[PDB]
Design an enzyme around this catalytic site. Structure first.
Site, short mmCIF file in Angstrom:
data_model
loop_
_atom_site.label_atom_id
_atom_site.label_comp_id
_atom_site.label_asym_id
_atom_site.label_seq_id
_atom_site.Cartn_x
_atom_site.Cartn_y
_atom_site.Cartn_z
N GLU D 65 -1.30 -10.73 6.97
CA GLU D 65 0.05 -10.46 7.22
C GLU D 65 0.75 -10.08 7.84
O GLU D 65 -0.15 -9.34 8.76
CB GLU D 65 0.00 -9.37 5.65
N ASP D 93 -3.77 -10.25 2.17
CA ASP D 93 -3.38 -9.63 3.74
C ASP D 93 -3.98 -8.93 4.34
O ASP D 93 -3.81 -9.46 5.82
CB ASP D 93 -2.96 -8.09 2.90
N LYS D 119 -1.88 -8.54 -10.28
CA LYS D 119 -2.24 -9.48 -9.41
C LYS D 119 -3.52 -9.79 -9.36
O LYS D 119 -4.24 -11.21 -9.02
CB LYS D 119 -2.48 -8.36 -8.30
#
Ligand SMILES: C[C@H](C[C@@H](C[C@H](C[C@@H](C[C@@H](CCN1CCCC1=O)N1CCCC1=O)N1CCCC1=O)N1CCCC1=O)N1CCCC1=O)N1CCCC1=O
Ligand SMILES: C[C@H](C[C@@H](C[C@H](C[C@@H](C[C@@H](CCN1CCCC1=O)N1CCCC1=O)N1CCCC1=O)N1CCCC1=O)N1CCCC1=O)N1CCCC1=O
Ligand SMILES: C[C@H](C[C@@H](C[C@H](C[C@@H](C[C@@H](CCN1CCCC1=O)N1CCCC1=O)N1CCCC1=O)N1CCCC1=O)N1CCCC1=O)N1CCCC1=O
Ligand SMILES: C[C@H](C[C@@H](C[C@H](C[C@@H](C[C@@H](CCN1CCCC1=O)N1CCCC1=O)N1CCCC1=O)N1CCCC1=O)N1CCCC1=O)N1CCCC1=O
Ligand SMILES: C[C@H](C[C@@H](C[C@H](C[C@@H](C[C@@H](CCN1CCCC1=O)N1CCCC1=O)N1CCCC1=O)N1CCCC1=O)N1CCCC1=O)N1CCCC1=O
Ligand SMILES: C[C@H](C[C@@H](C[C@H](C[C@@H](C[C@@H](CCN1CCCC1=O)N1CCCC1=O)N1CCCC1=O)N1CCCC1=O)N1CCCC1=O)N1CCCC1=O
Ligand SMILES: C[C@H](C[C@@H](C[C@H](C[C@@H](C[C@@H](CCN1CCCC1=O)N1CCCC1=O)N1CCCC1=O)N1CCCC1=O)N1CCCC1=O)N1CCCC1=O
Ligand SMILES: C[C@H](C[C@@H](C[C@H](C[C@@H](C[C@@H](CCN1CCCC1=O)N1CCCC1=O)N1CCCC1=O)N1CCCC1=O)N1CCCC1=O)N1CCCC1=O
Ligand SMILES: COc1cc(CCNC(=O)c2nc(-c3ccccc3C)[nH]c(=O)c2O)ccn1
Ligand SMILES: COc1cc(CCNC(=O)c2nc(-c3ccccc3C)[nH]c(=O)c2O)ccn1
Ligand SMILES: COc1cc(CCNC(=O)c2nc(-c3ccccc3C)[nH]c(=O)c2O)ccn1
Ligand SMILES: COc1cc(CCNC(=O)c2nc(-c3ccccc3C)[nH]c(=O)c2O)ccn1
Ligand SMILES: COc1cc(CCNC(=O)c2nc(-c3ccccc3C)[nH]c(=O)c2O)ccn1
Ligand SMILES: COc1cc(CCNC(=O)c2nc(-c3ccccc3C)[nH]c(=O)c2O)ccn1
Ligand SMILES: COc1cc(CCNC(=O)c2nc(-c3ccccc3C)[nH]c(=O)c2O)ccn1
Ligand SMILES: [Mn+2]
Ligand SMILES: [Mn+2]
Ligand SMILES: [Mn+2]
Ligand SMILES: [Mn+2]
Ligand SMILES: [Mn+2]
Ligand SMILES: [Mn+2]
Ligand SMILES: [Mn+2]
Ligand SMILES: [Mn+2]
Ligand SMILES: [Mn+2]
Ligand SMILES: [Mn+2]
Ligand SMILES: [Mn+2]
Ligand SMILES: [Mn+2]
Ligand SMILES: [Mn+2]
Ligand SMILES: [Mn+2]
Ligand SMILES: [Mn+2]
Ligand SMILES: [Mn+2]
Lengths: 180, 180, 180, 180, 180, 180, 180, 180
Positions: D65, D93, D119
């Protein structure tokens, strides 16, 4: 000249890495403007050497690669005249204060077995440890002793595959592979 | 004056190391312009002291060497008036918060046994630890307790032999050795 | 090697000045470790060139000396292909945007008249301005046009005599003078 | 525009955090000037990701990320083509070199169970680890494996509640909560 | 993608120049990865604008180019609502506090007359000054008023021809010229 | 005013330490120009608090002392609303993420027993840990739990006795002691 | 020792100014710990010398004060052996490349006439310019030639009266005045 | 509190400007958290004062605004006790070493005539110069002497209108105007 590989090396590698490889190539009578494939190899080998020393303790490694030939041999003499190890016939890359041995780092476009066979055939001093890395994510070391922990070595091969991807993205990988 | 040894010291050692040794020599009525061999010795001893404190934990050592005489004695008083150890008759180099003792660092051109015998004969406070280093790669310490780990001590003797090589390379070593 | 002149150059001149002179000498097949007198001359000429450009306005001079041979010639082409001046046969040191001419800087151990006669005989392009400096405090320029103001030129010759004093203080001046 | 939420984000978060979130929003066709609530969410998620990587060893995590979409996928390819793990369908991420898995970080205004369910339903690659944080101080992770130690995770939730307090102090929290 | 022009732009121009041109291109829906010729043009125009403001006094120019569209128009409003000049229909590049007029800078691969004719035809506000530069070393301005002194303008065209040489050296100039 | 104690505080303590103590004193209606003894106490307490947090891990402590009253209470709320500990009636100095408790640091000119008795009598929240230091080298903590290791605590008391020596050296200690 | 004047000097003057005055006093066998009034005078004279050189052009003055005795005399030789002026019997403070003369700066607690009479009586070289400043705001120079412009000289005397006020504020001025 | 004006001030003005205004407001018993309109006024007045001193020569102005009350009056005494001008009854903003007078800077939301009438009525010392600026682009000074050149003053009013635009953009201007 004006090659795409040269501008990629200055953009892909750290400025000091580029300067150290330029000094090393010029010291041995090589031009990074023309030997652009070798220019990318010296930069890659330099970064791997510095990432290798970044793994471990603070005083674990003594960096030999990156110095000029005279000073690099001066450090080797001080390390040999202190610990008592044998003087290597060729300039190694690092010295392990934890394992009491020199380390020869290699980066490979072919198979890790072929280079190591050539690297071990050249280095007559069998005490000098050898650690090879490849652009595909493979590694091999003397007596299966990989020195660093798994995470530090994994970060090295990950960076190696990123350089390979950025090279093939701009179509310099094919000429880079068939050039070793 | 204009000696080769002086220009070598400013080129071999860190700028702050040179400035700290110049202040220490001038505070004791010595001129680095003329006492160039002693100038190289104070710089070498200062770097070894700072490399010694670099080994270990973050709050392990309290650096005494490098301060002016008044402030250095002020730190010694605070260390003695807190831990309860005896006040040393002479200014030590460091204090070990882990071992609760002062450390006297020595750098030697002759044999490590001769200096330690003179250093232990001077220091009447037997509690103060003593650690000697030589330019050939030897070391010796009180009760065979070398305090730091092997890697940090090896880095010290390696730097010592590098200074010896750079001195003999420009032919200042012979005058430096027969001067202690 | 291990010469007194080499350690004096690294101590007398700015680190970047030393690095730029080392690159220039190596690019032309010269070793600063052995050609130590020429090492001190390239450093002195580089500092004079940079002090010369420091005099005047902000955009007055374009520094040619200090760049590698390929890029230095690239700037010369851009200056010639823009202002319209003739391409010099040899690489000059600076270009004057105020006077529209290239400048060839010279530093001299003998007489300023002898070098200028040799410098003017080599440079066939009569448009290129020539400015000579000596280690004794003398100067001479083409058509008596000294370009900079008196104070900036005086600071150059003052630094030149300081380098001469520091050289003779350590007894390198005699070998440096009888070497041009 | 001229919103209070925008000026709060530039004042609450680090300048580089704001710049990285602005680039990420613009790359996906979003305006931080108008999508100010989403602007505060991307900044919060970015800081949590960077605080997460700050916990652990030096070479433990590879930050995905914060990079642009093309380079972020390039790192994912190098990590997959080296360790041998499966290529995730969506951009994660981080990657754990210690646990050999990718990490998907989530920050939540509702309940940690609801986001994780969404998620985990999106991420088809069951190997990718998931770690959720909430603005109330709750957390939940895959197989109850919270990766970092307790102190590093506690510092994350403490910062999250500070952002929530500063938002409600200026009365932006109500609009921020009912917007996820 | 992976183009030679892109890597040349990142290597030829200053990092902040590259970042400002990337933000400007993305703000107007353009990709520097694909529009690499336009990427080199925005960078060149940005550097010329900044070199232009570098000439003159300290408070002479107010830089409009390089800001985002909203803030750039905010500065234009403050300049118009203070001096009393007319609001330009299009965003200019600079404002001259000495001459009380806006400046539109142009960089040209063709002839300076053609662009100026198109630039003057677009800008209906006849008060806005126009200054064109070419990659061959030519320039032209409104009412023959070139604003800056000769030396600052000469440095601009010299840099322009250097960029042209470095482009043709790697064979990107032909595609760059036939693209305006 | 113009007191010797004030100039000693600015010379003995770090500039940021002096600025933080000045803001804290002014926020509570106190003048460091007149309350010079209290000025030296707030600076000493601030340095001890920061040295205390320097011991241990990287994310172990959350520094509360040194912030303004509103933000310091904001951090306390985030720590309480996350870990679940009780809200202290008075502002503590630090929070231990390893031991899950707040820490109240005290520096003492009298006996460590007297202050702790007053500090424990004020703090009704018995969960808040208390750690006292004295200018003579003594320390005492709640349940004999001294939190940090021995070396970090020893460095704190050593600095405390150095401040006491420098105060008595200029004859400010007597007024400083009989003022608590 | 532990004097109020010493702590005031370290707090009133710039750190490098204090270090340069300490080196100058120690080089001439003086202790700033005991000669605290002379310590404040050397610092004041050093700052005035540096503020004096700050006035004028960039290459106007060559700073002699602040260097060690050997190097300061080396610069004087280079200035004399270049411009042709006479060697001063005593070390001056600056040299004016614009007026071609050395400058002797003086700071005075009594009347400017008395010091100048003593300064002119000592300096036998009548070519050396003399410029005196007082703590009350007076000044006097050789042949009424005050070298700098009015604004730069006014800033010097303003700083001098500020030092006088800060001294009397803490009651060190009376001992400082009756000590010259 | 939590106001939009406060977060705008920290985002619009330089960090040091915000810190200096916070110290000035607290020194006079004011809270920037509540007096947010006055917080924006002190910051604006501080920036205008610093931009004003940025115009002119290097040693032209002595900045009085921005210092604490005691030191600011100390500078005023040194300026008065040196040049001989009268001591102003109220603290001015700057002093002009070129014009030998103090300057009182004013920033206005109403008409420049009204403030000046109130500023001139308060300042009994008629020698102190007065210079007013408005948020609409107007200015007025004593005896029509605007001190700085036109370009520096124009940059001040341009920044003033930018602050006015950013305030009305977020709808704080109406409350800011009807508050003076
Ligand atoms: C010592 C110094 C240079 C060192 C080279 C090496 C570089 C190091 C820099 C670190 C910080 N990181 C990490 C993040 C980016 C960065 O910058 N890493 C490691 C990873 C890549 C990199 O760059 N190291 C190690 C000690 C400090 C230092 O810088 N070298 C060069 C050869 C010999 C040597 O010891 N030396 C020595 C004399 C000349 C010189 O330059
Ligand atoms: C504290 C400070 C100076 C310290 C001396 C010592 C120097 C240290 C610097 C480190 C960083 N490294 C390592 C790489 C290069 C470098 O630079 N090392 C250690 C190796 C060589 C070196 O240089 N240390 C340790 C703490 C931080 C610091 O700098 N000293 C001087 C004597 C007393 C003391 O504590 N002090 C204290 C007051 C005056 C001053 O200057
Ligand atoms: C531009 C840059 C380097 C410049 C060389 C030159 C050095 C300059 C530095 C100044 C600051 N001073 C003055 C005080 C000490 C110092 O440091 N001076 C002048 C006096 C001695 C010195 O050092 N200048 C001038 C512009 C900024 C700069 O640094 N050069 C090198 C050759 C070409 C060139 O333009 N470049 C260009 C690309 C590579 C590089 O490095
Ligand atoms: C590597 C670099 C940026 C890193 C982002 C990350 C930021 C890091 C900075 C540290 C120092 N701290 C901590 C205290 C304040 C501060 O500043 N932290 C962590 C906490 C908040 C923060 O800010 N890290 C980690 C390595 C060094 C660094 O800076 N990023 C950005 C995305 C990818 C990445 O690796 N990169 C990489 C290329 C572009 C760029 O910018
Ligand atoms: C103000 C700031 C950036 C400025 C852009 C401009 C850059 C300037 C930098 C100078 C120093 N030099 C010269 C040598 C190398 C270098 O670095 N030059 C001029 C030549 C090339 C260059 O780079 N200037 C001018 C003022 C200071 C500064 O930096 N800009 C960007 C657009 C608006 C603006 O005013 N701003 C403003 C807010 C955002 C930001 O970043
Ligand atoms: C975070 C920041 C300031 C911190 C205070 C503290 C200071 C720290 C500095 C370190 C580096 N060392 C050590 C050697 C000299 C030095 O400088 N130490 C510790 C010892 C003395 C000292 O100075 N720390 C810790 C994190 C980084 C930092 O700087 N503070 C202030 C109160 C709250 C807080 O967390 N903050 C936070 C926002 C405002 C601000 O300024
Ligand atoms: C050159 C260098 C030091 C110089 C001394 C002098 C200091 C100068 C610093 C400037 C910047 N300002 C101004 C604002 C604050 C600051 O810092 N000013 C002038 C005002 C007070 C001050 O401090 N100057 C001038 C050139 C650059 C420099 O720094 N000196 C010391 C004696 C000889 C000399 O030339 N040298 C030379 C070798 C050793 C060394 O250190
Ligand atoms: C001297 C110092 C601070 C000065 C304030 C002032 C700030 C100056 C900074 C310059 C650089 N620029 C310009 C671009 C951005 C920047 O940063 N400008 C002017 C414009 C805005 C700004 O910020 N100046 C002027 C001299 C150097 C300096 O910094 N002040 C504060 C009040 C008294 C004073 O003289 N002082 C003095 C002691 C405490 C302190 O901090
Ligand atoms: C070709 O001459 C040189 C010499 C040096 C100095 C010491 N060199 C090494 O130590 C080293 N060189 C290589 C390498 C790289 C490219 C082509 C062939 C080789 C064998 N690979 C390594 O792994 C390695 O350690 C530096 C650069 N070029
Ligand atoms: C010897 O090859 C080189 C070449 C270069 C590149 C360009 N060189 C110059 O431009 C230049 N060279 C000298 C010089 C110095 C030493 C010995 C002989 C000469 C003639 N003197 C100058 O004034 C001057 O401008 C740099 C260094 N060495
Ligand atoms: C909305 O498009 C984007 C895309 C990116 C690149 C990759 N994005 C993530 O990886 C990511 N995005 C969010 C998020 C944030 C706001 C609204 C909705 C979501 C789902 N939350 C995450 O936890 C997370 O990892 C960055 C920013 N915005
Ligand atoms: C294409 O949209 C944009 C828009 C902006 C913002 C404002 N732009 C200018 O002000 C500007 N644009 C150019 C230019 C460059 C490439 C192709 C075509 C043109 C006309 N040339 C100029 O001289 C100039 O001032 C920035 C970048 N791209
Ligand atoms: C006197 O008002 C204040 C208030 C603050 C904010 C919070 N203060 C503390 O937390 C704190 N204050 C002291 C202390 C120091 C001097 C005199 C009396 C006391 C009790 N000692 C501590 O140990 C401690 O933690 C800061 C400074 N002064
Ligand atoms: C006392 O020995 C020294 C010597 C030096 C080196 C050179 N000194 C000067 O050049 C110099 N010295 C003074 C001064 C200051 C205090 C007491 C008496 C005098 C005469 N005043 C000046 O104006 C001046 O230029 C530096 C410091 N102390
Ligand atoms: C309100 O008390 C203070 C006092 C100071 C110290 C000195 N102040 C000035 O010198 C000054 N104050 C103002 C101003 C600003 C807001 C409201 C009312 C006024 C009159 N305007 C000016 O132009 C100016 O020079 C700083 C801040 N606030
Ligand atoms: Mn190697
Ligand atoms: Mn190798
Ligand atoms: Mn010692
Ligand atoms: Mn010792
Ligand atoms: Mn040349
Ligand atoms: Mn030349
Ligand atoms: Mn993500
Ligand atoms: Mn996520
Ligand atoms: Mn434009
Ligand atoms: Mn344009
Ligand atoms: Mn507290
Ligand atoms: Mn406390
Ligand atoms: Mn002097
Ligand atoms: Mn003097
Ligand atoms: Mn004011
Ligand atoms: Mn005012």
């Amino acid at each position: 000249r004006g090659s795409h590989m040269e501008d990629f090396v200055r953009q892909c590698f750290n400025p000091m890495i580029v300067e150290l490889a330029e000094k090393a190539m010029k010291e041995y009578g090589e031009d990074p403007k023309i030997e652009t494939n070798k220019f990318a190899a010296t930069c890659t080998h330099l970064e791997v050497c510095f990432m290798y020393s970044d793994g471990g303790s603070k005083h674990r490694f003594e960096i030999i690669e990156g110095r000029d030939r005279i000073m690099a041999w001066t450090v080797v003499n001080s390390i040999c005249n202190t610990t008592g190890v044998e003087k290597p016939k060729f300039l190694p890359d690092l010295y392990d204060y934890k394992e009491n041995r020199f380390i020869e780092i290699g980066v490979t476009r072919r198979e890790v077995h072929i280079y190591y066979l050539e690297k071990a055939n050249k280095i007559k001093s069998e005490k000098t440890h050898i650690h090879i890395f490849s652009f595909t994510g493979e590694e091999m070391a003397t007596k299966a002793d990989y020195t660093l922990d798994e995470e530090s070595r994994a970060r090295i091969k990950t960076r190696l595959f990123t350089i390979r991807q950025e090279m093939a993205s701009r179509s310099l990988w094919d000429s880079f592979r068939q050039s070793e």
